[PDB]
């Protein structure tokens, strides 16, 4: 268990249940104490958050080229925030707010983390990424961080094998049930969560 | 007794022998008790779709000599009695009137010791204002003997005062045009007994008994059995002087021939004088069977008295011989019950109880049934004959012979008898009878008039409203009982047309009512019946409306999550007239867009171009809020229409100010940019875009809130009228009018009362008037607060902050920038 102490944690439109900032601080510390490190945020819908936090991150089919498949996260919570919502309306057209998740990896996986200035998920970057990770795509026990688009913010792609070794816990940053589609307001980010959200330094050169 | 449908119809065509009546009594006076005795004695039974008991049918059979005493046209010795169910407390004023309006007579139950209580007095006023004839029964005499142990004369004087109080009310408030309607024991219009033990009597019953032992006609015997008549025991001589020659006191006839026998049974039995009881019993010819011969104390007294003077008989006698038939009563009630010309073809038909004329059927209420969630109409035929399959004009509240508003020309699926808890289909039903109808609940909310003449006006309307102006959050204390509550609400919502059960976005279970009390009883029914589970209920909350006062300061723009779609719109106020027309079905979502546009254009000053481009109403697809498509050459615009409408439904359900519904908000879509590929503008993309643009546009359009306001109608005696104004002047009340009933000293004060000022209103009005005021309030209109909702200190802002906190929102209302495109 990596969720710390307290009641049963669940995800709701009203916010993550039994998940205070203080509990997060405890869970985070205990994670590092066991050799884990924070690598970014993942925004998604409620049921997905339930699956990821309690069943673990598991590989699945996604709509892109096979060579870029993996678990997508972002160091900047504001980016991941845009995905923290229903992607499809229910029968009546309801679109619920989702939840922000914090993604941790074993520190032993850090030698596999690389960065690039190129724009990811594009054929003009595949060659350079395959150079950094020392093998042809897709990513496996390695990760790549770079601009999600030209001039855009950074995203991190965890190879599926690496993603399944993550530990994911809820963020203390809430989504807004009354502003689904709105952007994350930095002032709604708990100062104490910001203090534990530094990212590791990724390698710019292959091993 | 068990009857066939043929028999019921047979004694239903004989309207001269029908008694439409209700029981006026305080609940603590054994109202239910006396009603039971009536059912167990004369209750009618039929030779699978059940209904909530609304009316009971009773059958009484009398002798040819008895039928001659009736001072109104009669035919045969059979009598059909309709006991119309009455509310348990005055507070349910609107339905207290509903019952009285379909009744012609009333059995008024008063107390022996306490006499006439305040509420029984108030209700009687109303019944009298309805031109209803009273017959009195002095109940709970038992207490006067067992507890107080009063003397015969003391008890007599007690009745005298009681009857005196009743007639003070009757002669004051009964309408002059009915003649002397006061009650007189000597005339058999007053009974005495104890519902508890099930015994009761009238002077006529004892008069019939002694009629022979005195060689005298019943008439002059009961004349003597009350008042100052004395039969000297020593001289065997009748007298009107309470002293003999030597100056000794003489006992009055009432005490001697009526009270004395009863007093002796009470004394002999309760004193366990086993040797007197037998002698006393044979004297009066009260024969006990097997088991009964062993009883003693109250057990014995109860059996003896029940067999001696069956309560139901004393009551039925009065009901048949003195209560008016439909024929007799409608002759002077018609003018009062018709909202049109007095000499109209229909009003005339109502006075004559004409079964041949055009139909005039009155629906007093809708009754919950077991046939799905449907409601059965309940009421009375005042003219013509109602038939199964018969097509009728369903004339609602707003109906007027002129316009075709609130009019539904449908067919009666089935006509049925309301045999208490059960239903009995019949071919037809002539004027004068109470009846139920099938297949009307979707055309009539609660009340209305059924007609077959397209020149007939409604009958005296009873104002109601389905507007849920008050609501609460329901929540199980044990999280496993959740399903029981979910089905409980689904159940609650079905037992009442004016109760609302829905889920807010946040997922809360909401119960909404038409008033403080109405919502109160619903939550009690839910926690003991529909659900039966321990519930956590939040304090009552008033339902407000969010609206705009001007057009958006600037164009509202919002972008989709994927940044590939954009909606440009602007919000503007809708005229109250138009909002009213929408709420009243004139402007209709289900209507043809071209016929509907003509109306908005011609009658309401809308550009027919705009009215033709209505995409939807909201909330709930029919609210007084509109989306208008004013875009020019937007490719694939129609492919996002379903998404935009959806967004509108959610946006108008819970507005950006504090989660309250929108009202009178027009949204104009000025422009839309879409991704060429449909894959990138599905529901998930457009819905949040449209919704946020709407909030943005709303916030830019001078946001305000509206509060619900009641129209209250108070009946009150002149003296206590001052208490009415006293209460209204600290609840922002506003007097509409103050009319006085011609002869009587009864006033009718009408005033507007903010719903958020009505909590505990009847309680305060009760005190300020000594309980003599009779309140009736219905939702009337919405009122836009002047103050700024965005200002936490202003009145509107004070409401907003409190509510936003309560919901756990950010205290301050979001700016339009939050929902505007972030850039
Ligand atoms: N989601 C983010 O926070 C994020 C961060 C950076 C970039 N992106 C961009 O968004 C695009 C979509 O990525 P995505 O991840 O939102 O959708 P995806 O198609 O890559 O994954 C599909 C969904 O499955 C869900 N899921 C449910 N249970 C899961 C489990 N047990 N294990 C793993 N996933 C589970 C995930 O939440 C995800 O939303 C990417 O192409 C990327 O460019 C997203």
Nearest to A182 among B647, B649, B692 (CB): B692
What CATH number corresponds to the domain at position B258?
Answer: 3.90.1430.10
What CATH number corresponds to the domain at position B487?
Answer: 3.30.70.870
Q: How many domains does chain B have?
A: 6
What CATH number corresponds to the domain at position B762?
Answer: 3.30.70.240
Ordered by where they begin, the domains of chain A are 1-207 (3.90.175.10)
**Domain shared by B639 and B561, yes or no:** yes
Cα of B689 from ligand 1 centre, angstroms = 21
For residue B479, the enclosing domain spans 463-543
**Domain shared by B594 and B739, yes or no:** no
In short, whether A49's Cβ falls inside 6 Å of ligand 1 is: no
**Domain shared by B569 and B670, yes or no:** yes
3-state helix, strand, coil in chain B (%, to 5): 35, 25, 35
Strands B78-84 and B105-111, bridge-based pairing: unpaired
Chosen domain end from B432, B462, B492: B462
What CATH number corresponds to the domain at position B586?
Answer: 3.30.230.10
B479 CB near a chain A CB, below 8 Å? Answer: no
Inter-chain residue contact A14 with B506, CB threshold 8 Å: yes
Cβ atoms A166, A56 nearer than 8 A: yes
Residues 6+ apart with CB under 8 A from A103: A38, A39, A40, A41, A42, A71, A73, A158, A166, A167, A168
Contact residues, chain B, for A87 at CB < 8 Å: 684
Q: At residue B607, what are phi and psi to the nearest 5 degrees?
A: -65, 120
Q: Which of B473, B441, B469 is nearest to B754 (CA)?
A: B469
Element of type H or E holding B231: strand B230-232
**Domain shared by B166 and B208, yes or no:** no
**Domain shared by B579 and B490, yes or no:** no
**Domain shared by B570 and B689, yes or no:** yes
In short, whether A57's Cβ falls inside 6 Å of ligand 1 is: yes
- At B139, list the tokens: 């109940």
Inter-chain residue contact A89 with B683, CB threshold 8 Å: yes
Torsion B439-B442-B443-B445 (CA) sign: positive
Task: Please tell me the distance from the alpha carbon of residue B498 to that of residue B468, in angstroms, as a whole number.
Answer: 8
Q: At residue B350, what are phi and psi to the nearest 5 degrees?
A: -80, -35
| B25 annotated as a binding-site residue | yes
Taking CA B185 as the corner, what is the angle to CA B200 and CA B159, rounded to the nearest 5 degrees?
A: 75
**Domain shared by B616 and B528, yes or no:** no
**Domain shared by B690 and B809, yes or no:** no
**Domain shared by B119 and B86, yes or no:** yes
**Domain shared by B45 and B169, yes or no:** yes
HEC per residue, chain A:
CCCCCCCCCECCCCCCECCCHHHHHHHHHHHHHCCEEEEEEEEECHHHHHHHHHHCCCCCCCCCCHHHCCEEEECCHHHHHCCCECCCCCCCCCCCECEEEEEEEEHHHHHHEEECCCCCCCHHHHHHHHHHCCCCCCCCCCEEEEECCCCCCEEEEECHHHHCCCEEEECCCCCCCCCCCCCCCHHHCCHHHHCCCCCCCCECCCC
Count CB-CB contacts under 10 A for residue B3.
20
Inter-chain residue contact B689 with A181, CB threshold 8 Å: yes
**Domain shared by B359 and B438, yes or no:** yes
Resolution to one decimal, Å: 2.5
CA dihedral B153, B158, B159, B165 (to 10 degrees): 150
Chosen domain end from B506, B528, B543: B543
Cα of A62 from ligand 1 centre, angstroms = 8
Strands B133-139 and B190-194, bridge-based pairing: parallel
> Taking the mean position of all CA atoms in its chain, how far away is CA B91?
10
**Domain shared by B486 and B422, yes or no:** no
What CATH number corresponds to the domain at position B356?
Answer: 2.40.30.10
The best mutation among A83, A158, A166 to test binding of ligand 1, ranked by most ligand atoms within 8 Å of the C-beta, falls on A83
Cβ atoms B111, B31 nearer than 8 A: no
């Amino acid at each position: 268990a990596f969720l710390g102490d307290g009641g049963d944690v669940s995800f709701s439109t009203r916010g993550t249940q039994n998940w205070t900032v203080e509990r997060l601080l405890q869970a985070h510390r205990q994670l590092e104490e066991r050799g884990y490190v924070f690598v970014g945020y993942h925004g998604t819908f409620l049921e997905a958050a339930q699956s990821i936090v309690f069943g673990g991150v598991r590989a699945r089919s996604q709509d892109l080229d096979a060579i870029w498949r993996g678990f997508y996260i972002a160091g900047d919570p504001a980016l991941a925030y845009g995905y923290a919502q229903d992607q499809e309306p229910d029968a009546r057209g309801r679109i619920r707010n989702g939840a922000l998740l914090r993604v941790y990896v074993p520190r032993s996986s850090l030698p596999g983390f690389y960065r690039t200035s190129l724009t990811l998920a594009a054929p003009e970057a595949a060659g350079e990424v395959e150079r950094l990770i020392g093998h042809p795509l897709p990513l496996r026990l390695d990760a790549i961080t770079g601009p999600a688009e030209e001039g855009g913010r950074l995203e991190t792609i965890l190879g599926w094998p690496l993603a399944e070794r993550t530990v994911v816990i809820p963020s203390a940053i809430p989504t807004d049930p009354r502003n689904v589609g709105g952007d994350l307001d930095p002032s709604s980010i708990p100062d104490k969560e910001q203090a534990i959200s530094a990212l590791p330094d990724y390698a710019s050169q292959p091993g | 007794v068990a009857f066939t449908v043929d028999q019921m119809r047979s004694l239903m065509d004989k309207v001269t022998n029908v008694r439409n009546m209700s029981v006026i009594a305080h609940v603590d006076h054994g109202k239910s008790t006396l009603t039971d005795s009536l059912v167990q004695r004369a209750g009618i039974i039929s030779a699978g779709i059940t209904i909530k008991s609304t009316a009971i049918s009773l059958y009484s059979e009398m002798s040819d000599e008895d039928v001659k005493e009736i001072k109104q046209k009669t035919d045969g010795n059979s009598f059909l009695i309709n006991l119309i169910d009455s509310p348990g407390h005055v507070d349910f004023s609107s339905e207290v009137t509903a019952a009285l309006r379909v009744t012609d007579g009333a059995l008024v139950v008063v107390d022996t010791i306490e006499g006439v209580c305040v509420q029984t007095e108030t209700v009687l006023r109303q019944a009298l204002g309805e031109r209803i004839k009273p017959v009195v029964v002095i109940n709970k005499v038992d207490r006067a003997l067992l507890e107080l142990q009063v003397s015969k004369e003391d008890l007599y004087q007690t009745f005298a005062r009681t009857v005196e109080s009743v007639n003070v009310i009757v002669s004051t408030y009964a309408d002059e045009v009915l003649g002397d309607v006061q009650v007189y024991p000597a005339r058999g219009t007053v009974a005495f007994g104890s519902g508890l033990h099930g015994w009761a009597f009238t002077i006529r019953q004892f008069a019939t008994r002694y009629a022979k032992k005195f060689g005298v006609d019943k008439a002059k015997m009961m004349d003597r059995l009350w008042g100052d008549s004395f039969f000297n025991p020593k001289t065997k001589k009748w007298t009107n002087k309470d002293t003999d020659a030597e100056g000794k006191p003489l006992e009055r006839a009432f005490n001697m021939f009526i009270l004395d026998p009863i007093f002796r049974l009470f004394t002999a039995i309760m004193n366990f004088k086993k040797d007197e009881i037998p002698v006393l019993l044979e004297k009066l010819e009260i024969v006990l069977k097997g088991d009964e011969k062993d009883l003693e104390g109250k057990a014995l007294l109860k059996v003896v008295m029940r067999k001696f003077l069956p309560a139901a008989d004393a009551l039925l006698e009065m009901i048949v011989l003195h209560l008016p038939s439909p024929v007799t009563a409608q002759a002077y009630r018609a003018e009062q019950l018709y909202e049109g010309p007095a000499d109209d073809a229909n009003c005339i038909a109502i006075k004559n109880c004409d079964p041949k004329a055009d139909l005039m059927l009155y629906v007093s209420k809708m009754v919950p049934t077991s046939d799905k969630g449907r409601f059965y109409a309940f009421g009375r035929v005042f003219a013509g004959t109602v038939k199964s399959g018969q097509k009728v004009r369903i004339q609602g509240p707003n109906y007027v012979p002129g316009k075709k508003d609130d009019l539904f020309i449908k067919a009666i699926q089935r006509v049925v008898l309301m045999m208490g808890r059960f239903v009995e289909p019949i071919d037809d039903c002539p004027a004068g009878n109470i009846i139920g109808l099938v297949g009307i609940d979707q055309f009539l909310l609660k009340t209305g008039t059924l007609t077959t003449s397209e020149t007939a006006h409604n009958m005296k309307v009873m104002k109601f409203s389905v507007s849920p102006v008050v609501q609460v959050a329901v929540e199980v204390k044990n999280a496993n009982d959740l399903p029981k509550l979910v089905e409980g609400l689904k159940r609650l919502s079905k037992s009442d047309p004016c109760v609302l059960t829905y889920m807010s976005e946040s997922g809360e279970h909401i119960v909404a009512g038409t008033g403080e009390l109405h919502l109160e009883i619903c939550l009690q029914d839910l926690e003991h019946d529909h659900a039966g589970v321990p519930l956590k209920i939040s304090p009552p909350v008033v339902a407000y409306r969010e609206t705009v006062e001007s057009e958006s300061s600037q164009t509202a723009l919002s972008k989709s999550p994927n940044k590939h779609n954009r909606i440009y719109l602007k919000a503007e106020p809708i005229d109250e007239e138009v909002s009213l027309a929408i709420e009243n079905g004139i402007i209709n979502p289900r209507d043809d867009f071209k016929a509907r546009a003509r109306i908005m254009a011609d009658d309401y000053g809308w550009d027919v171009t705009d009215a033709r481009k209505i995409w939807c109403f909201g909330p709930d697809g029919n609210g007084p809020n509109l989306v208008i498509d004013q875009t020019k050459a937007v490719q694939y615009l129609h492919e996002i229409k379903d998404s935009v409408v959806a967004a509108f439904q959610w946006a108008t359900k819970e507005g950006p100010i504090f989660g309250e519904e929108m009202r009178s908000v027009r949204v104009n879509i000025l422009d839309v940019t879409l991704h060429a590929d449909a894959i990138h503008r599905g529901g998930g993309q457009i819905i949040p875009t449209m919704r946020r643009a709407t909030y943005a546009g709303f916030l830019l359009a001078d946001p305000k809130i509206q509060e619900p306001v009641f129209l209250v109608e108070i009946q009150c005696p002149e003296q206590a009228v001052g208490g009415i104004y006293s209460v209204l002047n600290k609840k922002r009340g506003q007097v509409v009018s103050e009319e006085q009933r011609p002869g009587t000293p009864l006033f009718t004060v009408k005033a507007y009362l903010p719903v958020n000022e009505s909590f505990g209103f009847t309680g305060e009005l009760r005190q300020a008037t000594g309980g003599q005021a009779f309140p009736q309030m219905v939702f009337d209109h919405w009122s836009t607060l002047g103050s700024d909702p965005l200002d936490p200190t202003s009145k509107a802002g004070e409401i907003v902050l409190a509510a936003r906190k309560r919901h756990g929102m950010k205290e301050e209302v979001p700016g339009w920038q939050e929902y505007y495109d972030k850039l």
